[PDB]
Design a protein around this ligand. Structure first.
Ligand SMILES: N[C@@H](CCC(=O)O)C(=O)O
Ligand SMILES: N[C@@H](CCC(=O)O)C(=O)O
Ligand SMILES: [Zn+2]
Ligand SMILES: [Zn+2]
Ligand SMILES: [Zn+2]
Lengths: 260, 260
């Protein structure tokens, strides 16, 4: 007996955003974005009806070291609050151990965002000075990257961030960007290339991505371990990428609406 | 009862190559390359002994539209000749339907290789002229990309390539590279960015990668459908990527040894 699939996602531009006129709209129609379009495509190919829901705690997903409880979208899947996650959720080892991921629908890497004019061009540069503070998003894969990294440069950076005060970590990507823009160049933000490049093309056009990506990874559609939707979803992602649909959606939400 | 894992791979530089003194060596020690290094690591992390074997027909893998028989490394897995494939094997829908793939260990896209000086800077450029011929590897994912593309430019390119006489397709990457180098700029080769970038750093340093990639995809470690080896292999790939080993191996075989 087919039932409506509960999709957990997160408000993160340009993946999922509230339409300007969202208040006069209902259900899935309230949202727009890359992942909204992707959800529709996946549902079509897999043949299911769905309901988009914004993750309760607004987080991507990390495990509490003391209680071992998962939060964010990962947690909603782990505890059965959602049937699938369609968002810019990074495929990682610790997550793959508790939930399933489709092959990546988008490739990306950690990058550096600076306020135009900031004397910084690489991660090494950030590590060799103190005047400019830098941080990452909380409960995300970027923070985890620096925590599980043995690489000398990334180790030094983590040592700084982990004990830096005031806290250099932010609750949302939006908070990180706002901090860069109002820091007069005294704050650099570490975020995924995908978001960095998006913001770079948005007014007031005062930020820019610098240096090469620190790593190479991807986002995947996630389902609870052993879910019957996993197989179809995985094949759907491959089909969409091969048809060029994923590439079309990328341009549609990143550069076609560019305002810089 | 632990058994030696049979690994199928292909002689493709710099993934797997015969050592200069292979005749004086034995077994796995006869080979060297990115995938040889990766195979050793995957085996250590998954806890298995293995034997490297070069695919009999020297092909990646495609299903014959007549006999419906799979050839290449994919075939070796499908018919039970090998237990795992560790090579630059592209993750594609048609293949995922018959074998399993780990998450990607390398990201890449189709690209253009020209003899330096060739008046070509994009796929569109190639499609708008006829003086310069162009082709791809036969029996591979690149040829399939063009055969199935619905994008105007790529369809136009396929329409030309599939009917060009003599054949513009080649049996091995080396053959394609040699054709580019000896054609005085009258032949351009379409191949994966990974192989393009590698050749670009090899003497006589007469080739160049031009334009942006035509698509985005990845290589994955493949196992027979349902193999109990798949889970561990996938987690090993994620762990090795997160620890920076994959990036270290690409630098080692692509640039640290660059000849240009
Ligand atoms: N995509 C990340 C969140 C953003 C970040 O950590 O930079 C995740 O899935 O955790
Ligand atoms: N990596 C490709 C072979 C090379 C190519 O097609 O350009 C495959 O798995 O078929
Ligand atoms: Zn579709
Ligand atoms: Zn706690
Ligand atoms: Zn290791």
């Amino acid at each position: 007996a087919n039932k409506t699939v509960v999709v957990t996602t997160i408000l993160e531009s340009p993946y999922v955003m509230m339409k300007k006129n969202h208040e006069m709209l209902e259900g899935n129609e309230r949202y727009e974005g890359y992942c909204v379009d992707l959800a529709a495509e996946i549902a079509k190919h897999c043949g299911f009806k769905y309901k988009l829901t914004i993750v309760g705690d607004g987080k991507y997903g990390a495990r509490d070291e003391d209680t071992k409880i998962w939060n964010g979208m990962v947690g909603e899947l782990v505890y059965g609050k959602a049937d699938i996650a369609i968002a810019p959720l990074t495929i990682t080892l610790v997550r793959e151990e508790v939930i399933d991921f489709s092959k990546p629908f988008m490739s990306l890497g950690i990058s550096i965002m600076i306020k135009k004019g900031t004397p910084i061009e690489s991660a090494e540069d950030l590590s060799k000075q103190t005047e400019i503070a830098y941080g990452t998003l909380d409960d995300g894969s970027t923070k985890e990257f620096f925590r599980r990294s043995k690489i000398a440069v990334f180790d030094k950076m983590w040592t700084y961030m982990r004990s830096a005060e005031p806290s250099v970590f932010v609750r949302t990507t939006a908070e990180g960007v706002a901090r860069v823009r109002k820091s007069k160049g005294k704050y650099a933000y570490l975020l995924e290339s995908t978001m960095n490049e998006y913001i770079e093309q948005r007014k007031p056009c005062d930020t820019m991505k610098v240096g090469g990506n620190l790593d190479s990874k991807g986002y995947g559609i996630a389902t609870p371990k052993g879910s019957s939707l996993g197989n179809a979803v995985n094949l759907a992602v491959l089909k969409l990428n091969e048809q060029g649909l994923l590439d079309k959606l990328k341009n549609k939400w990143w550069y076609d609406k560019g305002e810089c």
